[PDB]
Design an enzyme around this catalytic site. Sequence first.
Site, PDB file in Angstrom:
ATOM      1  N   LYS A 113       0.797  -1.222   0.000  1.00 40.26           N
ATOM      2  CA  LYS A 113       0.000   0.000   0.000  1.00 40.26           C
ATOM      3  C   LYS A 113       0.837   1.284   0.000  1.00 40.26           C
ATOM      4  CE  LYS A 113      -3.838   0.126   2.662  1.00 40.26           C
ATOM      5  NZ  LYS A 113      -4.700   0.705   1.555  1.00 40.26           N
TER       6      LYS A 113
ATOM      7  N   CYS B  14       8.456  20.999   9.403  1.00 39.58           N
ATOM      8  CA  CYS B  14       8.203  21.604   8.093  1.00 39.58           C
ATOM      9  C   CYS B  14       8.053  23.135   8.059  1.00 39.58           C
ATOM     10  CB  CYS B  14       7.000  20.933   7.439  1.00 39.58           C
ATOM     11  SG  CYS B  14       7.350  19.284   6.857  1.00 39.58           S
TER      12      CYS B  14
END
Lengths: 383, 383
Positions: B40, B145
């Site tokens: 996946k 981030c």
Amino acid sequence: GELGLSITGLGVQYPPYSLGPDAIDILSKRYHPESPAMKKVLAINRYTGIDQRSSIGNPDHPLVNKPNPPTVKELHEVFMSDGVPLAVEASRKAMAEARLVPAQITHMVSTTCTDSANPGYDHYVAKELGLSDRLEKVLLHGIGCSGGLAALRTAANLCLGHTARGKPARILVLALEVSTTMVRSELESIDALQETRIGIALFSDCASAVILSNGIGEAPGKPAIYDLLGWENRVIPDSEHDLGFDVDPMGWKVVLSPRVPVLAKASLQPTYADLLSSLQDQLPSSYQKPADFDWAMHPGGATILSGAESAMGLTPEHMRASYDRYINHGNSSSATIFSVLNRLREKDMDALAPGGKVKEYVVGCAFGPGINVEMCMLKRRMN
Amino acid sequence: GELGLSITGLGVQYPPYSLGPDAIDILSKRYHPESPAMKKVLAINRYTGIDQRSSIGNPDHPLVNKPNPPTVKELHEVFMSDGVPLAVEASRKAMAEARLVPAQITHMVSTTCTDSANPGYDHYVAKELGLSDRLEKVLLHGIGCSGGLAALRTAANLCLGHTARGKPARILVLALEVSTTMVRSELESIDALQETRIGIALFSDCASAVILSNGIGEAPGKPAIYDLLGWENRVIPDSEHDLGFDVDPMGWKVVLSPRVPVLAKASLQPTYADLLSSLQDQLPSSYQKPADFDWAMHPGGATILSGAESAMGLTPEHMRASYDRYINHGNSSSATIFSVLNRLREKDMDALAPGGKVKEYVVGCAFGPGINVEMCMLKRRMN
């Protein structure tokens, strides 16, 4: 001319089941066979000048008594479960003495070298304190023992940034450290390597916080504990390998060379001179030579304290709050700093440097990895 | 009113192997037999819309070919060995454009979530650049981030602190991230835990820099790239568990919920309104609605860019520089933003949102752990 910077509150919170005695790592040394490098660490441990080390728990703590030393991740969990609430508390007290409500806080400048997280531990203190969602946060890394005064200096410039725009600034300055949980890590290195390694003998747990105000729109009377007059910071060249805290699967491994006290002592005179060089006319003639001041020294080694009293010609009493913290709580890395400043303004006034003259002018001093040196000039307010 | 803050330089340095093809982590399963959760991820890998991804090594690099995932200690080594030369080169290029000499840099603000160190990596960078000994450094932690824009904001405040005191300020703002080296750590989690985990499909390696100036001691000629006009920042409540990086024996483990893109989307409008309202009096009529500006978005996920397009009413081209970096380099955490801004002012200004219309005003925007939101307003000096 006038910076309008002042510490308007201070608060310290050492963990409760603190005071891990001296029989401490003598006892935890039950995860290793007897060895001559280990024996020497036990021996030195007896003359560090430290009586009690403040710790999040006793030599019985589960985390310290796993068949293996706790992993860096297991350290993070206890840093959160036991470290954070010291940090939340230290902040409440500081904010209480500053008479500020959660909403008034504009920035937060935190430090630590005994954790790593995203989001960082500062997010969680802020959360529980209910600080603004619009708050400006800074979490310093890479600096260890010099962290308290670094965060203070950075708080200063930040405050001044807001002074430029005309906005009130109330910066929460936070230091939290939890090193005692890394005893097992240090015990493995002493066993496996056969190097002495005096790290376990010195470090302890604590949190401390100060509110720094830029004086804009300050509550009437503008009552502060210390004013912040100036600061000097510096990095000693080619001294990275002498002092450090390397990342490891077991937390962080301490690095300390024979050179550290000498470099630490040697730095004091030029750094002091530069602190005063940029402060003339601002202070009275009765505050010119190092002994004219009280010295908020970061201890973290007996040798560092006596190092100073020789190099700057001080008595132990000049650093009376430094000794008081060191002897009764150990070296709590970046958090000892404010813990000294808060102690200095209490009942220490008696054991005090000269005949019995409490010094209006206080010099904060500290160093850490990189060998950064930090020093600040404070003005205590005479009640 | 006039902050006098300006980005006078920029520089970006991607690693040599940079272009890491899509085959990379597929073939990196010389380490795990196929499993559902693994299948996946390898599938999601091909849905990100990332063409190439920047890396300090190829799939054969020794660090990621050991019997076990490398320890966090080993990551640091290669972070020093291969990450730092990048930060040095990035910084070198920024200062060159700025026409600045090392002795002129008064502050340094750096970020990273892919390393822990004492002294921190910004020390080695300063040394390499020959920066001053009296340099004031800030090494930001815990913010992943949003690091790039947070460091900008923090430098902004620092710049003004100096302004308040009549001093020049030239701050090196630096972001270094090495994330590809954690491929084996993530791959093991995917297998061992059997959960999706997409991080390994997104993250990449880069270093980017910017010089923020306070204008004092600058001639009124002052050629610059962007003026910095304002900034908003916020924490989305009760969203800590959606984005994160947890400390591990084998580095840091990604936390990346499916809620993330949704929350991002929902913060866009309100945070933009807060930004614009502090600056509207300062902006012309032609820069008033989201669509009027260029958009320096931090990617990481294609959903962020698609989310921004409809949340604010934008076209992909409105953020053409974001796409160029995402497609061709992946998500370099805090290092992407300054790269987006660097690329923006190149002859990317030919895919302009509407006609031949480069926008004079660009809003920077970035999400990170805690769910921190960063937005800033830039003025592009049109030659």
